[PDB]
A paper describes a structure:
Stl, the master repressor of the Staphylococcus aureus pathogenicity islands (SaPIs), targets phage-encoded proteins to derepress and synchronize the SaPI and the helper phage life cycles. Our previous work has shown that the Stl repressor, an all-alpha helix protein, is a modular protein composed of an N-terminal domain with the characteristic helix-turn-helix (HTH) folding, which mediates DNA binding, followed by a middle and a C-terminal dimerization domain. Trimeric Duts show high sequence conservation at the residues that make up their active centers, which has been used to define five catalytic motifs (motifs I to V) that are the signature of this family of enzymes. For all these Dut-StlN-ter complexes, the Dut maintains its trimeric state and binds three independent Stl monomers, each of which uses predominantly its middle domain to interact with individual active centers of trimeric Dut.
The mDut-StlN-ter complex was crystallized in the space group P21, and the crystal asymmetric unit contains two mDut trimers and six StlN-ter monomers, forming two mDut-StlN-ter complexes with a 1:1 stoichiometry in which each mDut trimer interacts with three independent StlN-ter protomers. In the mDut-StlN-ter structure, the two independent complexes are largely identical with a root mean square deviation (RMSD) of 1.1 Å for the superimposition of 642 Cα atoms corresponding to the Dut trimer and the three StlN-ter protomers. In both complexes, clear and traceable electron density is present for the entire Dut protomers, except for the eight C-terminal residues corresponding to the catalytic P-loop motif V, which covers the active center of the enzyme once the nucleotide has been bound. In the complex, the Dut active center is occupied by the StlN-ter molecule, forcing the projection of this P-loop into the solvent. Interestingly, a detailed view of this structural comparison shows that the trimer of mDut in complex with Stl is more similar to the nucleotide-bound form than the apo form. The differences are mainly concentrated in the unique and short α helix (mDut residues 65 to 70) from the catalytic motif III. In the Apo mDut, this helix is distorted, losing its helical topology, whereas in the nucleotide- and Stl-bound forms it folds as identical α helices. This observation indicates that Stl recognizes the Dut active center in its competent conformation for nucleotide binding, in agreement with the capacity of Stl to inhibit the enzymatic activity of Dut. In contrast, the absence of motif VI is exploited in the complex with mDut where Y116 presents, in the different Stl subunits, rotameric conformations alternative to that observed in the ϕ11Dut and hDut complexes. As in phage and human complexes, Y116 from some Stl protomers interacts with mDut D109 and R110, but in other protomers, the rotamer is identical to that observed in the Stl free form, losing these interactions and forming new ones with L67 and R70 in motif II.
Numbering used by the authors:
A (entry chain FFF), B (entry chain EEE): 8 to 153
C (entry chain GGG): 11 to 37, 40 to 46, 60 to 153
D (entry chain HHH): 2 to 135
E (entry chain III): 2 to 132
F (entry chain JJJ): 1 to 131
The structure:
Amino acid sequence: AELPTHYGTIIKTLRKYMKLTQSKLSERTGFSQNTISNHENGNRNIGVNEIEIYGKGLGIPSYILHRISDEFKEKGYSPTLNDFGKFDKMYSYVNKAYYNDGDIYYSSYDLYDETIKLLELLKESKINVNDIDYDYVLKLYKQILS
Amino acid sequence: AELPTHYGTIIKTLRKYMKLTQSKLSERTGFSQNTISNHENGNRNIGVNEIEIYGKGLGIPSYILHRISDEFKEKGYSPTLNDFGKFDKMYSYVNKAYYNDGDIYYSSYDLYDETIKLLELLKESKINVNDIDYDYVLKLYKQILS
Amino acid sequence: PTHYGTIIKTLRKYMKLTQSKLSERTGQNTISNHIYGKGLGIPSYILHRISDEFKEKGYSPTLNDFGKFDKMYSYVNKAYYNDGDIYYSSYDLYDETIKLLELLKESKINVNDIDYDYVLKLYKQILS
Amino acid sequence: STTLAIVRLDPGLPLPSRAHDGDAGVDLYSAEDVELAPGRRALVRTGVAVAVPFGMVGLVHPRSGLATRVGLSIVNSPGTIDAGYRGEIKVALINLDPAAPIVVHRGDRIAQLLVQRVELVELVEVSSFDEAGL
Amino acid sequence: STTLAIVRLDPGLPLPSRAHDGDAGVDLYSAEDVELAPGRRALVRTGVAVAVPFGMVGLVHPRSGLATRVGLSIVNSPGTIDAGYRGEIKVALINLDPAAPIVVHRGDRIAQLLVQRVELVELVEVSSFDE
Amino acid sequence: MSTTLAIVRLDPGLPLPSRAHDGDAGVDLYSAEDVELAPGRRALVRTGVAVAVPFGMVGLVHPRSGLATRVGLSIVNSPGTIDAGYRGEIKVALINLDPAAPIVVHRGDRIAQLLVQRVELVELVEVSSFD
């Protein structure tokens, strides 16, 4: 099995956002600089096996990578990857709500879809994800599960 | 958090019924004669994890401690506490039915309430709990579980 | 419980090993009118299953032809542990084996002269 | 090599058995014929009692076959068998098909019995989890 | 010997408690009065929150009494409490009887909590089973 | 060290089940197909995965609450058992316990979680009566 070439663009963008060198990313995954190098350029395609290993190395769940790759196949690029800091802020709020609140734990379908939906509402409302507190997110999350 | 003083009266009454000195209940719970006396009189209220330790020391499941309490909160006293010898005999049968008979184990709602009902019926037929055997209780016990 | 003697013996006679052959294993020796397992010679599940057919019909057609069974069971097992269609739809592999041997006998087809794929097709059919 | 004592309260039925070595369950059998109409339930005897060792729990599961094919389920799934319980194992069967009745006969496999370890934990109230850990 | 730390969100209900020495679970009370019409369901607060140790799981089983007698089951049985979870424990009740409504009373025991070790297995993808 | 669980992907279009947080009992299973369940209807639903449950252990398929609470989506045989010898596709027997509202399950949706747990492979010893 071999993945499409846009995965290499996903790993490049997410290595640079997580502030890791090729060398640092190597030490974590086990891949040599050369491997990561070609992967990030499109000299080689990332093995289906390997994407799990990259996810653990970056410290990003593999299914996030997959959902970001699905955006590529559809829209030709990825709006989640281009605004990854915003998704990351909201996703940690969404994640904390799920583990601390009973109106969430027992009602969630998909943390990713809910993360994306809270983000879309804040944009409609012209509100930045850094200018709100957890208490505000929770009240808005409860709405979308209700 | 503290339980509302009536647990004091409940433990003292049950400790006396259990033919226990403050020494025996002290050498079992870890509480000093001083703390048991201040619980039993009302000076100190019984913490929520203290009622669990008392139950174990007395040899009574805390659930009965909580349901006797509930009697007080409604009526102003506990018929069950007043007559706890009639109740202890019946409950030991009820307990033996449940753990040893398919018709009871799978059909039972509340061991406490079912012991109440079986007394009412022995009472209203003018029979003594001290007169009857396991087999008579069981027959009647199977009836009330329909 | 004496019915098992026939079973233990018949399994030996079928198993192509002498008394001494099985009489050296897990301890004529201590075999009289002759379950701990005959060195797990056959899973005790089957020995107890053949026993159960004695208490329903006087005999066991399964033991009467253990040759044909052992082949079919091994197939029915492969299908169970490897096919999603079988695993979620099976009711009892022993019974389902007996049913497949039943159908094969009336079609005058031999167990030893058949492949898994054939049996798997039939199997899927009896389960639907 | 842990041991589960079991009494055939009904001798006409087979002894529950482990089909293969790695298999989690042993099939239980109905002692009685029951017809369940769509939606209806019934408490059916299996004609066995078991001695679940202290520190363990017995678990009664529904079996995939009847579940997928005719909608046969257990209301209180999974059935919890306490280590103190010495009476007959019973199974609360419900028919979850909307139209077809289900007819269980004496001797049919109606459940898997699993035996697992359980933590016999003691419940301590804390002010808040923040103070006592996460 | 293991201690499950628990927070009583609802101080009006007693700490749940293992009724008999070897019993596998501890009943959870309803914190609310509910009526379930046939085939209808309800998420019901139990007035507690727990800290399942890392390497264990919370498991919410339905009570055999309510289910046979009255058809009261749990939709997501057995309900998983993850070790990470620190919210109020709730029970997804459902009336699986075709005609009789069920009434739950604040105070009623309406489920039992088990706690078990769980293999926190490492998934590793392979191409084909060589096993 | 930790216990390995080997997993194959009979359908590579789906992402690999993953353990979101360190001590989460289960890993979510995704649906391999689109399905409409009308009220009281059920379906056996492929997930595009096979597993190698270690000997001594058992795969258990639990319902995701939320689907259960909000649309009454359950599992007929809950909790579904994977034996250590099984190597075929995990399929989930889903059912609609809501009486009015059809349920639509999209390929790629999270329809169940897989726990692995140790199981006592007990020896049955028949006896006359007890001790």
